[PDB]
Amino acid sequence: DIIIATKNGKVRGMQLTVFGGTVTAFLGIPYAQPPLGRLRFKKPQSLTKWSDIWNATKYANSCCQNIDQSFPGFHGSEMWNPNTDLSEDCLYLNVWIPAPKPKNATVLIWIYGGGFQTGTSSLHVYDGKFLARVERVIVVSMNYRVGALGFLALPGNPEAPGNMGLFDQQLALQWVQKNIAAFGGNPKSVTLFGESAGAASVSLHLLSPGSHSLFTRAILQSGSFNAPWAVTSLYEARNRTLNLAKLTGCSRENETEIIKCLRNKDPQEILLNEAFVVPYGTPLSVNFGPTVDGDFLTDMPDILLELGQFKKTQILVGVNKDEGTAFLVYGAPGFSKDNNSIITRKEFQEGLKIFFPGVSEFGKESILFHYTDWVDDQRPENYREALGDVVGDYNFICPALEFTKKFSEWGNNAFFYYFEHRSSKLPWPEWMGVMHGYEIEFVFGLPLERRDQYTKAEEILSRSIVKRWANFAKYGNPQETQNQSTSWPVFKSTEQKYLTLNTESTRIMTKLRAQQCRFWTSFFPKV
Numbered sequence: 198d199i200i201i202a203t204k205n206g207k208v209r210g211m212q213l214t215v216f217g218g219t220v221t222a223f224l225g226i227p228y229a230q231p232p233l234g235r236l237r238f239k240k241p242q243s244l245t246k247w248s249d250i251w252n253a254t255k256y257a258n259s260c261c262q263n264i265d266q267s268f269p270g271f272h273g274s275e276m277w278n279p280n281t282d283l284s285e286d287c288l289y290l291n292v293w294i295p296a297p298k299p300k301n302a303t304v305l306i307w308i309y310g311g312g313f314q315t316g317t318s319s320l321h322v323y324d325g326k327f328l329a330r331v332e333r334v335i336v337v338s339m340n341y342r343v344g345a346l347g348f349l350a351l352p353g354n355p356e357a358p359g360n361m362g363l364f365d366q367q368l369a370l371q372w373v374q375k376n377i378a379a380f381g382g383n384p385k386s387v388t389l390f391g392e393s394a395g396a397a398s399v400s401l402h403l404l405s406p407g408s409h410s411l412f413t414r415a416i417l418q419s420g421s422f423n424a425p426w427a428v429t430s431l432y433e434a435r436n437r438t439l440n441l442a443k444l445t446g447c448s449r450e451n452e453t454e455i456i457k458c459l460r461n462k463d464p465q466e467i468l469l470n471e472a473f474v475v476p477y478g479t480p481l482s483v484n485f486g487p488t489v490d491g492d493f494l495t496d497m498p499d500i501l502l503e504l505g506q507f508k509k510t511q512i513l514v515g516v517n518k519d520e521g522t523a524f525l526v527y528g529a530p531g532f533s534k535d536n537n538s539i540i541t542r543k544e545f546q547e548g549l550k551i552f553f554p555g556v557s558e559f560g561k562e563s564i565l566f567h568y569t570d571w572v573d574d575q576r577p578e579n580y581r582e583a584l585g586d587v588v589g590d591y592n593f594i595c596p597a598l599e600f601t602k603k604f605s606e607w608g609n610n611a612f613f614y615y616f617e618h619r620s621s622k623l624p625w626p627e628w629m630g631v632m633h634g635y636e637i638e639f640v641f642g643l644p645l646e647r648r649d650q651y652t653k654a655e656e657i658l659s660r661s662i663v664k665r666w667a668n669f670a671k672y673g674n675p676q677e678t679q680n681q682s683t684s685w686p687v688f689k690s691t692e693q694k695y696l697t698l699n700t701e702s703t704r705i706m707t708k709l710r711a712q713q714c715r716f717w718t719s720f721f722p723k724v
């Protein structure tokens with residue numbers, strides 16, 4: 198039996214057997230008052246003390262969310278769908294501590310992705326027991342509100358201020374600050390890491406002054422706030438908040454009254470309507486996401502980034518080789534996970550309509566032009582690979598690169614990686630390559646489990662990545678100093694060196710996707 202006293206009461210965890218060792222897991226610790234009733238859409242409220250022994254022995258409810266129903270029974274999609282009950286009562290977190298209890302361990306806080314519409318900390322690929330066992334770090338992860346329940350925005354108005362999901366995250370960071378010492382943790386040594394919308398969240402915590410004292414360092418996997426999907430403007434936010442009020446018959450004039458009306462609607466009603474608050478959706482739509490609330494976010498984050506207004510610290514940033522492909526099978530014509538998705542020119546052209554609906558004709562022509570001068574005009578994968586690259590470059594790679602350039606210009610050490618290994622247990626077909634999110638299992642050390650049909654080469658890659666992540670958290674330097682590893686150079690805005698992660702050869706390369714990103718980062722914003 199293992200009971201830990203925390204500032205709001207006592208929590209009992211459970212022992213886990215890992216690699217002939219032991220990790221203690223505290224699954225499902227509440228960190229806020231359930232945001233129910235009048236608390237729906239408000240910032241997370243402080244939790245009142247309890248007196249019992251809170252049995253934190255299983256993952257808690259995941260936050261309300263729509264589920265991917267596109268490939269029922271297919272592990273490739275369903276591995277991302279929630280694996281606990283959905284409920285508004287979902288403000289909980291998890292802690293993995295090494296056994297024997299550490300003395301002053303570095304803490305790793307995970308923030309999952311999901312487009313700010315989906316996700317949950319309890320997923321199998323977010324299990325922190327391996328990191329705890331292997332690197333003697335403590336791993337924390339939290340559930341935070343997503344979708345309209347997490348980001349509906351009536352700016353100024355506290356009933357619906359926006360960014361509630363971010364303040365959930367923040368409230369969990371405070372919990373780590375006030376309690377992790379009791380678990381053997383070092384509150385002065387906290388590294389946030391997250392993927393996709395989780396990564397954009399991490400990057401917004403570097404910008405938010407209310408978070409500056411809640412962590413030390415930051416890791417951003419396939420995501421950053423300057424990505425086009427990561428921040429809703431005050432305009433869209435209001436137009437989307439107003440739209441949703443219509444589809445639920447909640448339209449009023451008293452802005453506080455439309456919120457009260459939305460407060461008596463059932464979570465399901467709000468959920469089915471989220472999709473249509475935009476006129477033309479894409480597979481990448483983030484109908485309700487972070488906004489400039491004037492609280493968490495005091496100005497538009499591009500301006501903050503550009504003028505050096507963020508926490509000064511080290512960052513680890515990276516992306517995957519095929520960020521875009523995963524979204525092509527959610528709408529792009531001629532694409533399917535069940536055939537090699539050879540598409541024609543017209544099909545590529547139609548796909549751009551799917552992914553760039555509001556963009557001018559000339560804008561879409563300019564995308565086609567920049568991506569369709571072929572090394573081989575006769576190669577039939579040409580247009581299929583091109584659309585994937587378009588989506589990946591525009592949505593993930595180029596914003597992550599631009600974020601890393603701008604952040605490092607203010608003097609801090611930055612490290613950039615390019616993950617280019619396809620999981621041998623990847624259930625999607627080969628033409629989709631090194632997909633969005635399929636580095637996570639490697640970061641969390643799943644390939645270390647020899648019982649799980651990963652190759653030996655994958656075990657070695659996960660083992661080095663785990664060491665590099667942990668070295669970055671403990672020491673601000675993501676080296677593997679022992680097994681004659683390739684040294685990871687800092688990313689500088691001049692030379693722009695990055696490290697490639699793969700089973701073959703880790704290499705130092707320069708200026709990732711240079712020609713592509715100049716199009717996205719300096720021509721395309723004009724159109």
Ligand SMILES: *[C@@H]1O[C@H](CO[C@@H]2O[C@@H](C)[C@@H](O)[C@@H](O)[C@@H]2O)[C@@H](O[C@@H]2O[C@H](CO)[C@@H](O)[C@H](O)[C@H]2NC(C)=O)[C@H](O)[C@H]1NC(C)=O
Pocket residue numbers: 436440441443444473474475476
């Ligand atoms: C701001 O919102 C209006 C309203 O959107 C419509 O109503 C919602 C409840 C939802 O069902 C949406 O899908 C609707 O489109 C947008 O106005 C509509 O725009 C579309 C296409 O642009 C048009 O076909 C509709 O007739 C419009 N309806 C009205 C009442 O004007 C408007 O475009 C949004 N603003 C922006 C910049 O997108």
Ligand SMILES: *[C@@H]1O[C@H](CO[C@@H]2O[C@@H](C)[C@@H](O)[C@@H](O)[C@@H]2O)[C@@H](O[C@@H]2O[C@H](CO)[C@@H](O)[C@H](O)[C@H]2NC(C)=O)[C@H](O)[C@H]1NC(C)=O
Pocket residue numbers: 529530531532533535536537538539
């Ligand atoms: C690849 O598959 C897509 C998806 O269509 C579905 O999946 C197939 C594997 C098969 O089960 C089809 O019967 C399904 O409809 C194909 O796209 C469809 O193509 C048909 C004609 O071929 C067209 O009428 C539909 O509109 C298309 N639907 C979509 C969503 O694109 C595609 O043609 C296949 N291409 C190759 C090269 O295999």
Ligand SMILES: COCCN(C[C@H]1CCCN(Cc2ccccc2)C1)S(=O)(=O)c1ccc2ccccc2c1
Pocket residue numbers: 263264265277310311312313314315392393394426480481482483523524527633634
């Ligand atoms: C409910 O269905 C909505 C569609 N979603 C996408 C699907 C398809 C792609 C695979 N993912 C699983 C997945 C993989 C990796 C990390 C996290 C999750 C689910 S989404 O809601 O998850 C979504 C939305 C907008 C985004 C905008 C920018 C980047 C990612 C986005 C994801």
Ligand SMILES: *[C@@H]1O[C@H](CO[C@@H]2O[C@@H](C)[C@@H](O)[C@@H](O)[C@@H]2O)[C@@H](O)[C@H](O)[C@H]1NC(C)=O
Pocket residue numbers: 198211252254
């Ligand atoms: C909390 O759990 C207590 C005991 O839990 C069980 O016994 C221990 C030794 C572990 O094996 C644990 O995994 C078991 O589930 C209960 O006695 C107590 O009533 C519980 N309190 C609740 C449910 O509120």
Ligand SMILES: *[C@@H]1O[C@H](CO[C@@H]2O[C@@H](C)[C@@H](O)[C@@H](O)[C@@H]2O)[C@@H](O)[C@H](O)[C@H]1NC(C)=O
Pocket residue numbers: 300301383385386387413670671672
């Ligand atoms: C635990 O360790 C603390 C020092 O943390 C270290 O310094 C900060 C600035 C970070 O760089 C972090 O990564 C380092 O590991 C001590 O100040 C503290 O008193 C120690 N407390 C206990 C109980 O061991």
Ligand SMILES: *[C@@H]1O[C@H](CO[C@@H]2O[C@@H](C)[C@@H](O)[C@@H](O)[C@@H]2O)[C@@H](O)[C@H](O)[C@H]1NC(C)=O
Pocket residue numbers: 660661664677679680
């Ligand atoms: C490093 O490699 C270990 C096994 O390799 C042997 O030990 C190291 C220290 C070298 O001296 C090498 O020449 C030997 O062949 C693994 O057990 C260990 O987990 C690896 N560590 C990392 C971080 O990858």
Ligand SMILES: *[C@@H]1O[C@H](CO)[C@@H](O)[C@H](O)[C@H]1NC(C)=O
Pocket residue numbers: 450451452453454
């Ligand atoms: C909006 O509602 C609040 C709370 O009831 C009220 O105080 C305020 O006057 C209303 N504003 C209007 C009606 O413009």
